[PDB]
Amino acid sequence: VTLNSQIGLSDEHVGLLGDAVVDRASIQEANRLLQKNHEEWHMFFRDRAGHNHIAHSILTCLALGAGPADIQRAYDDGVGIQRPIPAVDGATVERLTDEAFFLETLGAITQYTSFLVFFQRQMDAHGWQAVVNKYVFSRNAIAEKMLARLYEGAYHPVIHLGLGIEFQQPSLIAEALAQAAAHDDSHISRLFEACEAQAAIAYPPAHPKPLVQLLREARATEAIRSAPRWEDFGNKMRDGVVGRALLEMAAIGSQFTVKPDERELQRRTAEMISVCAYMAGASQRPGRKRKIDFFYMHTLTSSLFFSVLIRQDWISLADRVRLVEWKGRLDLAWYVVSGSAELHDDAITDYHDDFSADMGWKELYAAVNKEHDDGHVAKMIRALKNGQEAARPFEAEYPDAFPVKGDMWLKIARMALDTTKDWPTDQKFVMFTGFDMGWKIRPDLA
Amino acid sequence: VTLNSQIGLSDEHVGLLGDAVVDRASIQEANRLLQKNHEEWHMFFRDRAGHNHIAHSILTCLALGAGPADIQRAYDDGVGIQRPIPAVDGATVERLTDEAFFLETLGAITQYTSFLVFFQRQMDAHGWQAVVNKYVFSRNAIAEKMLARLYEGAYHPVIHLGLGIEFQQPSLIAEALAQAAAHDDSHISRLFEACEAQAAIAYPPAHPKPLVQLLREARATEAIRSAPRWEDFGNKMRDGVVGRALLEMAAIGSQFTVKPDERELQRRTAEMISVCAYMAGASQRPGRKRKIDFFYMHTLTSSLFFSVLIRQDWISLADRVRLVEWKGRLDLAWYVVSGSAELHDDAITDYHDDFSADMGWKELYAAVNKEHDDGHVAKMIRALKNGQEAARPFEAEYPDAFPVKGDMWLKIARMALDTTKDWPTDQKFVMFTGFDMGWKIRPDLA
Ligand SMILES: [Fe+3]
Ligand SMILES: [Fe+3]
């Protein structure tokens, strides 16, 4: 029992946004449940596509004005699928200090408990800021591995990492570092390194291209669009993009360069958020019902937490610039993984539905704090608010790099609640909306 | 503030070519901008492929008949990417007299200012002719490391040096010796030495083979054509040519020897100039557009500065031949790095475009002095002039070693202006034309 491994929320740094009052009984109700999830349940409930969203739903719902029972609502929904946490092999723990052992242990889902004990015990020594800036931002072998593993599994470790920095809870930061260390490899490091590779020789992008301009250039490149197959299934990123369209995707991804200025870093960070929302909202089929993509939304949810990192004064700006660059390049990969679906602006500009035809951010916050899900729909509307705010200082100055502007933000958030209400968790979203097969076999899609 | 460290231009030696009248206001205008670049901006703006062409563009444009507002143009266009010059570490400076410290400090980009201060203070002592003939042509440990470093990075340090000996400004010669000292190593030394190595045991090339003959045999050698890969990217030379085809490529380059005659020195110097222009003008794709290669064009821009060296009386003739020798042996390595693109004479004999179908050397000079570029296209046309004149007394006697002859010199200089007018600096040339990847991912190539 250490002060780090205890999850204690404080009414001081509670929410990046801060546009909602938090019922104080939730904070005592949240910590009580956050501690259970911290020492009872496995982070990975399956080996593949397994993530313990219990903490993410409890935290994000809170920052949107959650009640007491609404916090219990998040724990009760995601515990029905939750599996117990492995034991801690103390031999691995004491051995994880040797650089040779830490690398050979990476990829062990069953060793998550051991990695958590290690990062917690190392945080009790040099602090949560020193651990991250030597296991993530350090440019040595373990860093250049753990850093890519934060983007693994649809940016789920880097979402865990961002929350622990938002509410300042080193126990959470320990989990994210352990989650990234016990993740199966998706070969996405091979894409990150190649993208920063020809970003050296190829010079110079005098006028940096908008990220949306690279999205269109991606879909036209048939080798990229043809890289994912419905037969690849879970290994669309491993045995598809990275496996077939590596050299080609890196050619598009490399052209996304963030100049090392702070306003420029804020500028391009918002560009990624407008693109992510544009991806989840404009991936609709003319003629069919509106429905969001399960992996396009994960590009959006994670965008909010990259605004957390660029504000941290304890990360180097090159690393802060590196986090947005690696973010934007891996998004163009996921856009192809879902099927590179066609994005037209008419669906988001012309969207109406009586249920939320006049709801505001607050009403959406309220209506989302009570609905039963894994927390995904909540995180969407939370990021779309942040995307609206962080883009506005720049929205008018470059209208060609921001496809989502002004009122489109609220529209997408409304579409997020409409298309997932009165639907089970399995049938809320679609998996791979760019694949015509994804809509055929599903009956609820019509 | 020393007389050597002050860039003062005179109307006595203003251009190796000298076939253009120079607006005398430009000389005063060029001197006010070369000094800023001499004491404000870093020689390397990035660690890899980073070079300060501001001095190169201002110098070449001036000798081409630049006006006052055209000298400012070159500075105005290159300063946007420039980064601040590092500080000088005085301990390094005072310790740079010890041979051991000099050898350990090499390769430190952050110590360019320190090397520049050391080479300037040594030129204030024994002169500019004495500093170079003891740190370059001295056959000791340092000079043989620095000489191979003068060819690093596509002959850019020797481009600075050639510009320093041409206009007689010891401040520029200091920057060139400090740029080659602070350069990263591409392992091209291990190719230079193995070139001269079997150029001793193996004997004797009775009738020396032309340099266009060694190109073709190097492309047929599948073990040389296959060493560079698209994944190697930046380090195509370090971890590709020398990394894989060191022993092989050394068998081709060593056959390029220069007999120590003085007419043989200018006959083999002009043969390199015609071989280089043959690489940048014939590297086209039958069916696709016309566009030069970014590294083949660098082999031609440097040929003029090797015409500055063989005329220097203060360099020994044995050292003036080894320069042309090493130059010709590294040019063979760059033909392979770009991809050993097929060179067919038809592309430079049947070249027509209305924009410059009838332009002479005086109009190309006029138009290139007003086009906004890094200075590469102005320096292409200038080297083809020096190549037309110095190859003319040898063109007809050996028509089998001058693949570009007569009117072909003027067709390539037109080709430079057309394919690089109306293009941003990033899209003026292609990077690696022998690789099919280089033409696929670029949309402008059609
Ligand atoms: Fe998720
Ligand atoms: Fe250059």
UniProtKB/TrEMBL annotation, chains A, B:
Residues spanning the membrane: none
Any Pfam family hit: Questin_oxidase
Organism (species): Aspergillus fijiensis CBS 313.89
Name the UniProt record assigns to this protein: Oxidoreductase AflY
InterPro entries according to UniProt: Questin_oxidase-like
Keywords attached to this entry: Oxidoreductase
GO MF term list: metal ion binding; oxidoreductase activity
Highest taxon of the lineage: Eukaryota
